[PDB]
Design a protein around this nucleic acid. Structure first.
Lengths: 80, 199, 22, 83, 123
RNA sequence: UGGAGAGUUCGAUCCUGGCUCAGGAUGAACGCUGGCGGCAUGCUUAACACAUGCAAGUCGGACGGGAAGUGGUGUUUCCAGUGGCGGACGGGUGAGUAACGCGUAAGAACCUGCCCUUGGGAGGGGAACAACAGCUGGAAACGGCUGCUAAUACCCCGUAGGCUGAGAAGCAAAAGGAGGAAUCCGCCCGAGGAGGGGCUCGCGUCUGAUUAGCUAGUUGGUGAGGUAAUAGCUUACCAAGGCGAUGAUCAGUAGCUGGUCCGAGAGGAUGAUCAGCCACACUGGGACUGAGACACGGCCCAGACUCCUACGGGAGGCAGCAGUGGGGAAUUUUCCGCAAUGGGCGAAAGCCUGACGGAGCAAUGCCGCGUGGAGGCAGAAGGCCCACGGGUCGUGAACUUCUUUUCCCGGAGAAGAAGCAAUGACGGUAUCCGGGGAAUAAGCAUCGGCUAACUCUGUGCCAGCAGCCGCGGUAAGACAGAGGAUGCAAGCGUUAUCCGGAAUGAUUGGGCGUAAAGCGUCUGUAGGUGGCUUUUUAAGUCCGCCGUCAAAUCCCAGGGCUCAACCCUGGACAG
């Protein structure tokens, strides 16, 4: 199946963390079919594209732990 | 080695021109001769001795200079002038033209021993490129040293370069803009050095 | 060191269950 | 689906016609036209199209491993060598 | 230039390429045991007593090699290491010897080139 | 925003032309030397043979239980066993394969666990079975009988949109379990979505034609058989074709690509690391289970090896991580952790996880810093040259004031943790404050010309040098040592290898009277090219637009680690 999370591109101490749209039967840092948005830990840079989200979640995509919390930190996912 | 150690005024001699590796030393070259007519230097000699004059003045290596001339060649604008842009923006060279240090090899030690502050933050790296509107100043702890006080005691009378503006009392110097062709006062032809790397 | 009781990882267990499904 | 034109060279086969497609295309390294010719085994269950006819071939359901194309229309008649 | 329509028919392409010194599968250096250590005379302009040794490589080939410097200690059972460079004065010799490695000793009392010839630092 | 050459074939000149060198690069080795830090990288030679440990397990909110540990006086939790899901994910190698493997662009005859949208159903029964128990064959492995037993183990019956069929009609599904005054999860069928995986077609995909012939299910057509599915995939029969010089077949070699290196570009050489795809995993062969692997850590058979044996008979295979032997010029700690990201399982907790996150070894490379700074003599010793009247090494050093990064020592101490009894391997972390003292830290190559840099001795075609032209037979700046100088830098030099220089295969870029070069001359098929006018087509071509050209490289502009390397946004480009 397909799910939402974050990969790894930046090695060592600087863990930048990538975008997402990947299968569970694939790799930790491999092939990604579509792009969305990411966040940087030791910075104020928080993207997360909203029109890409909810459009991918309607067709069997599972929202797992890491894509969450950073979702509610922004103005998306609330009682609206 | 990062910066040449040993004989400094051996390169102020031989080459003909007189750079600032120390303060001021005689015009004549080495050995018993050299005060008379020298031999006819080849076409490749004028490209080799002119680049070694620019390499020694700033106290930079061949490995670090190779990057500053290649990135300046890939960038837009006059190549011959943008070699002197990224080389003058170094924290060890802007410190010589500020009046805080008597020479360039002594200015690298000043930046390395944590005496200089850039925009409030402390920088140790001499090969750091100083962008415009930056405040190059001294530290509050290193304000009481006798070497920093003696070098800035001779500065209120002498005129500093037009691309810089120093204020004698608070010991800070600001960099307004980029250095151009007629603003450089060095005895080097920038068209002979760019012709060497492209053999 | 070795354990006081006897044990053996049966690779024939996954084969017997595969023969039962067959 | 893709459509390619060509002349029939062989007709001595049961419900199968050998169509030779000529294609002119310029070389990406050079400049001039390089002509390539490959023969396709088309399907003809009505055995109407004989040798010499120029027919257009469209993509369809594979009736065999070599055959995958069918001959639907006809632009011109016999353009072959005289007997 | 050969015409454009003949360049599609024939198409110009280089050869399989011949090597200057066959040191196997792109290997910089090769090991081997010396079979016979002899002395041979040079070409037409030179006249000296040059020391050459036939090295039996790890592949099974027995090619000649030149010994640099003054004085050596290579016997009939010495395991040497070759370099790969021509001398162009002695016919057949396409290899050189790296001294200071394995059974090959370095040149005594040499103060100049210590990187090559395999000499240590004198205190 | 990109394109410098020179030496050598002559008495000499101008051409032609081969060779050689200056450059960059390489997952490199060797020799000399050797202060650190950041990031990356590391059997490229035997896909050789492998000790040991580890690399996949998890659920009792599916069951009959309870051999451990902790409470209470039976609940957590849980060794085995039944059952569910995952072992066809991830990791590694590239041997094989020039092939419908790969890359680009299209197509039809499809399947598809977990997830998701919609509709209906989920009733009522049966017979066993491990675990366990009593015996029992064997060295061991592995088991052999009898009896007892549960479930989301299995098999009927009832019902049924779907399926088969022109139609009428015929016919097939089930699991229950948990917290709570009825919620959650799961089960069965069908119709979709998504994602993944098959199959079809065309182009481009190495070299040699002193391999030109190749091919019987071989090509195709009817009929049955078969697959999830088209189909010679298959069988019988009929036709006899099918492939090829725009070069099949055969032989040698080889994973493909995004890209990488060089280059002005074109092009050439490759494709290590990262990522997509394919293939293999002791060798050869085969099938089973399952949605999917005919499947590294699964099974069965055979073979070569290794090991055990009460020789009757059995157990394994690292092209997973770390390591051993061996080969080799050469390539590392049998370390720590789940903390972070991810994978498996579970309504969770949590467990498993050398994937991975980190550390360790190695100057393998890239980048940054450091090993001292200023001041100092009339140029001190001591060396080298000397016409000995001096000069040079030399401000070099000593001598003086000064600052002390990094290394060392002591005290603090950001963030990567979001979760959320406050949860980290890395960490005596980054970084910051202070204290000794320059105190602990440089060499290597070269010096005839291209090549940037000189003489004096010794030797003396002797010993030796050497990329090329060439040096050495007594005064050779091209041998050996010294003084000095040049270049570079903890790197330097050498070697190997690709590209550049080679407009010396030239498509952009060359030539054939004499330098290499028109075949001895004609006819002529295929092929290439083809006068003039109008109309038409518009295929080529050209314009615009819509898809795709994965991401990451490269490039432009802009950010974050004190700079840089490195990391990163958007755009550009992907011709």
């Amino acid at each position: 199946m397909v799910k939402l999370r974050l990969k790894r591109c930046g090695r060592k101490q600087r863990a930048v963390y990538r975008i997402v749209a990947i299968d569970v039967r694939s790799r930790r840092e491999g092939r990604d079919l579509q792009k969305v948005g990411f966040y940087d830990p030791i910075k104020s840079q928080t993207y997360l594209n909203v029109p890409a989200i909810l459009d991918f979640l309607e067709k069997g995509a599972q929202p797992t732990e890491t894509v969450y919390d950073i979702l509610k930190r922004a103005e998306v996912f609330k009682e609206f | 080695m990062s910066r040449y150690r040993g004989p400094r005024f051996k390169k102020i001699r031989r080459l003909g021109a007189l750079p600032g590796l120390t303060n001021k030393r005689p015009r004549a070259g080495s050995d018993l001769r050299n005060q008379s007519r020298s031999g006819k230097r080849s076409q490749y000699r004028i490209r080799l001795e002119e680049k070694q004059k620019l390499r020694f003045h700033y106290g930079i290596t061949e490995r670090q200079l190779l990057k500053y001339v290649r990135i300046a060649r890939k960038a837009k604008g006059s190549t011959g002038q943008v070699l002197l842009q990224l080389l003058e923006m170094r924290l060890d060279n802007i410190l010589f033209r500020l009046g805080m240090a008597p020479t360039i090899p002594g200015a690298r030690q000043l930046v390395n021993h944590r005496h200089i502050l850039v925009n409030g933050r402390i920088v140790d790296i001499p090969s750091y490129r100083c962008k415009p509107q930056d405040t190059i100043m001294a530290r509050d702890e290193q304000k009481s040293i006798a070497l920093i006080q003696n070098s800035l005691d001779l500065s209120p009378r002498e005129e500093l370069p037009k691309h810089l503006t120093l204020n004698p009392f608070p010991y800070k110097g600001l960099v307004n803009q980029i250095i151009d062709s007629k603003w450089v006062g060095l005895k080097i032809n920038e068209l002979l050095v760019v012709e060497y790397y492209s053999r | 060191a070795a354990a006081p009781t006897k044990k053996a990882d049966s690779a024939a267990k996954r084969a017997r269950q595969a023969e039962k499904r067959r | 689906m893709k459509t390619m034109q060509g002349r029939v060279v062989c007709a001595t086969s049961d419900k199968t016609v050998a169509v030779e497609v000529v294609r002119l295309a310029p070389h990406p390294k050079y400049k001039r036209r390089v002509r390539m010719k490959k023969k396709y085994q088309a399907h003809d269950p009505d055995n109407q199209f004989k040798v010499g006819d120029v027919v257009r071939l469209e993509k369809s359901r594979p009736i065999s491993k070599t055959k995958s194309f069918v001959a639907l229309p006809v632009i011109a008649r016999a353009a072959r060598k005289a007997e | 230039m050969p015409t454009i329509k003949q360049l599609i028919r024939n198409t110009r392409q280089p050869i399989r390429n011949v090597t200057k010194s066959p040191a196997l599968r792109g290997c910089p250096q090769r090991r081997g045991t010396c079979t016979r250590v002899y002395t041979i005379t040079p070409k037409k302009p030179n006249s000296a007593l040059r020391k050459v040794a036939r090295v039996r490589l790890t592949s099974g080939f027995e090619i000649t090699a030149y010994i640099p410097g003054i004085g050596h200690n290579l016997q009939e059972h010495s395991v040497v290491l070759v370099r790969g460079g021509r001398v162009k004065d002695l016919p057949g010799v396409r290899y050189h010897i790296v001294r200071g490695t394995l059974d090959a000793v370095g040149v005594k009392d040499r103060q100049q080139g210590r990187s090559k010839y395999g000499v240590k630092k004198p205190k």
